[PDB]
Amino acid sequence: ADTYAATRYPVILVHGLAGTDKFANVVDYWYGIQSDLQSHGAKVYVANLSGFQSDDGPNGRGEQLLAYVKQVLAATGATKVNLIGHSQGGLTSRYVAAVAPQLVASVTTIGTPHRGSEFADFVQDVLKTDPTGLSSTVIAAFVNVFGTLVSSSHNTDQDALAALRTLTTAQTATYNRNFPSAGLGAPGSCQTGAATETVGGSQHLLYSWGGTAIQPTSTVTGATDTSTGTLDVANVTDPSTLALLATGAVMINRASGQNDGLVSRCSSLFGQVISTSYHWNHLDEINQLLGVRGANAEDPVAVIRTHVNRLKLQGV
């Protein structure tokens, strides 16, 4: 053990998706991440958000995270926290930074669709004629993989799809109006905002990164997975690999541009953008499934470890 990632304030990892900090009620959502960071001197807590899928309103995930942050501070005596969220977890983190600015030192979002997901929009349209969405081979593939990851649920198929409702272009647009942030750029400019924000007298360091494994090819526009070689074992051991390529292809055909399977580069931009060059799909971002990633994918654990060191050097 060392102090490489020994930040001043505790780090709270904030999951997104269907619910809880677990995948299939067995493995950690943030696979091998909390243990790695702790070995490097960081005091790392993992939020476990269940119940309401939405980040907004009474008892929404934002209020749940707010309550958790206060419990962590009460237990530790720390006065602020560093929030690192994935997918919807980035939006949940923004909630806390907006309503309790004095309790937050930094907000980092990983693969967060701040401007919505084209796939979430696709699903929304498909469900207008088919509530199951199974009439779509891509949606069927998505549900098959993500449905098996849902924890503490007796109806994973439904929950896996419900998790997309908060990520539509329309829903996120409303969310951004309700929770403004200097970290967001001008709507439709595909540019990030400010690296820091002043809320009340509090100062927050804002960061983000995303994966762009799914790249468009020729032209219906084609798509390729740059995380894997011409032929990779990840397509066999990690079923989400091919599924995310398919969902990412649908996004590309909706003019999303390069993406991670669910979130486009443009939508992921927030605060100081560390990188959008990582050859990752949505799940590689959290070292899933079970640490399996394509041959061309950077180490997500090393990336997070590097960022917490970055946070430490910034004084938080």
Partner 1 sequence: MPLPAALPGALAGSHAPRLPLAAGGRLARTRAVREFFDYCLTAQGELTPAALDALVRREIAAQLDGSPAQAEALGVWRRYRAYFDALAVLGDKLDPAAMQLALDQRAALADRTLGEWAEPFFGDEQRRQRHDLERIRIANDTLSQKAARLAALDAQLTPDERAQQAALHAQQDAVTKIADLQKAGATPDQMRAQIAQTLGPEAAARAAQMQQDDEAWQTRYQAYAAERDRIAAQGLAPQDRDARIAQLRQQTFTAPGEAIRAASLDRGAG
| Nearest CB to partner 1, comparing residues 121 and 238 | 238
Which residue in 36, 159, 225, 260 is the catalytic one? 260
State yes or no: 65 annotated in a binding site. no
Give the span between the Cα atoms of 88 and 47, in whole angstroms. Answer: 13
- What is the per-residue binding string for partner 1 in 6-45, x denoting contact by CB under 8 A? ------------------xxxx----x-xx--xx---x-x
Kindly tell me the sign of the dihedral angle through the C-alpha atoms of 270, 55, 281, 10. positive
Known binder of ligand: residue 171? no
Buried b (16+ CB within 10 A) or exposed e, 177-187: eebebebbbee
Distance CA 278, CA 298 (A): 7
86 binds Ca ion (CB under 5 A): no
The DSSP secondary-structure symbol of 259 reads B
Q: Which helix (H) or strand (E) holds 6?
A: none
Among 132, 190, 199, 215, binds partner 1 (CB under 8 A): 199
If one asks whether residue 196 binds partner 1 (CB under 8 A), the answer comes out as no
The three-state secondary structure class of 213 is coil
Among partner 1, Ca ion, none, the one that 41 touches (CB under a kind-dependent 5 to 8 A) is none
What is the CB neighbour count within 10 angstroms for residue 231? 8
Task: Burial-class residue 244 by CB neighbours within 10 Å (0-12, 13-18, 19+).
Answer: buried
For this structure, is 225 an active site residue? Answer: no
**What distance in Å separates the CA atoms of residue 192 and residue 127, rounded to the nearest whole number?**
32
Known binding residue 102? Answer is no
User: According to CB under 8 A, which one of 130, 217, 295, 315 is a site residue for partner 1?
Assistant: 295
Q: Which of residues 171-190 bind partner 1 (CB under 8 A)?
A: 178-179
Residues 204-233, one symbol each (x = binds partner 1 by CB under 8 A, - = not), give -------------------------x---x
Spatial distance between the Cα atoms of 204 and 271, rounded to a whole number of angstroms: 10
Binders in 73-102 for partner 1, by CB under 8 A = 73-75, 77, 95, 98-102
> Is residue 307 annotated as part of the catalytic site, yes or no?
no
Show the tokens assigned to 36: 């790695």
Say whether 282 is catalytic: yes
Please pick, among 28, 55, 86, 87, the residue that the annotation labels catalytic.
87
Which residues, 44 to 63, sit near partner 1 by CB under 8 A? Answer: 45-46, 56-60, 62-63
- Helix/strand/coil (H/E/C) assignment for every residue in 19-36: CCCEECCCEECCCCHHHH
- 250 to 289: interface string for Ca ion, x by CB under 5 A: ---------------------------------xx-----
x/- mask, Ca ion, residues 189-228, rule CB under 5 A, reads: ----------------------------------------
Residue closer to Ca ion by CB (options 147, 193) is 147
Of 110, 114, 93, residue with least CA distance to 174: 114
Task: Determine, following the binding rule CB under 8 A, whether residue 243 of this chain makes contact with partner 1.
Answer: yes
Strand extents, DSSP E, the chain:
11-14, 22-23, 27-28, 44-46, 81-86, 104-110, 196-199, 202-211, 214-216, 223-225, 272-278
Task: Return binding residues for Ca(2+).
Answer: 238, 284, 288, 292
- Which residues does the annotation mark as catalytic? 87, 260, 282
* Contact positions vs Ca ion (CB under 5 A): 238, 283-284, 292-293
Task: Return binding residues.
Answer: 17, 88, 238, 284, 288, 292
